[PDB]
């Protein structure tokens, strides 16, 4: 009388439901298992976003955008490199020139 | 390839397309003895007094 | 734990940054260290000077 | 900052010119004072942030 997705049995039931779908050569048990698994996946992903609804959601948006602004800051620095091509004199770097 | 590869994880372009498209290669140590390898791509494949001008690979 | 997404690695109490690549044998993680050896099927002419032989074509 | 090894874009004249735009000595030295007497140390000390580690060999 106790439901199986309550509470921590969620992932174990996910793999066991995949195993019950795979063990069956009958299409009916496979389709019932696929529907039960998609429903359990949606319920668990909703529960997971609701708990991550606050303060983890906020740092995902900042990281997603910080690497985005690094791919932006990189290309703008590259254009700044290409534009500052007037004269490159200063000493503290060397390089090989063979034969 | 740089632009398609910048838009990976937004669709599905990856390293295996660089290998399949014929851009990078897996060279190994017994075969590395007959490559003529450039270290950076611009700077060793430019035009001066010649060092080799027959490079066959270039390092990433 | 394979092809398994990242919520589920954490639901099984695992870390998604674990690389893998090791065995659990009696609850110990064991790694197999790669051992090098000589290439087989290949002729190598050496020269041991500390014997009766001038040359040696191992294979 | 970026400290990849073989990089041609970074050198020490370039870092030094940036450091002197934030109002420091371009070579990283600063003027410290003695903590016990308060008097300036006549050598300028080379201070800045470095990443330290803490090794597992505690006493």
């Amino acid at each position: 009388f106790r439901k199986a997705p309550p509470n921590y049995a969620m992932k174990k039931t996910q793999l066991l439901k995949e195993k019950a779908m795979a063990e069956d050569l009958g299409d009916q048990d496979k389709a019932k298992q696929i529907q039960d698994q998609l429903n359990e996946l949606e319920e668990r992903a909703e529960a997971l976003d609701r708990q991550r609804t606050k303060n983890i959601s906020a740092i995902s948006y900042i990281n997603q955008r910080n690497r985005e602004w690094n791919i932006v800051e990189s290309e703008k620095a590259l254009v700044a490199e290409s534009h500052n091509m007037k004269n490159q004199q200063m000493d503290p770097f060397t390089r090989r020139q063979c034969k | 390839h740089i632009d398609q590869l910048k838009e990976r994880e937004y669709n599905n372009y990856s390293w295996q397309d660089l290998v399949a498209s014929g851009v990078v290669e897996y060279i190994d140590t017994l075969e590395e003895e007959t490559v003529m390898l450039a270290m950076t791509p611009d700077d060793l494949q430019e035009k001066e007094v010649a060092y080799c001008s027959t490079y066959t690979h270039c390092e990433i | 734990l394979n092809g398994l997404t990242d919520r589920d690695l954490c639901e099984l109490n695992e870390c998604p940054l674990d690389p893998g690549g090791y065995f659990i044998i009696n609850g110990s993680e064991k790694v197999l260290i790669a051992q090098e050896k000589m290439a087989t099927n290949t002729v190598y002419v050496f020269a041991k000077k500390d014997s009766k032989y001038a040359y040696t074509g191992e294979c | 900052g970026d400290a990849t090894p073989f990089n041609d874009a970074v050198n020490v004249q370039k870092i030094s010119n940036l450091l002197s735009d934030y109002g420091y000595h371009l070579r990283g030295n600063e003027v410290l004072y003695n903590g016990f007497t308060g008097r300036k140390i006549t050598s300028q000390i080379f201070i800045g942030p470095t990443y330290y580690q803490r090794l597992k060999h505690m006493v």
């Binding site: 290309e75 | 390293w15 660089l18 | 690389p19 | -």
Partner: peptide, 28 residues
Amino acid sequence: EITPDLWQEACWIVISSYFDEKGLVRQQ
């Protein structure tokens, strides 16, 4: 069309794609 001196940004895209596809312990 070729990629010139805009190349440190492009040398590391192929490195990042390599390490997405193949982890570090793929040889095991």
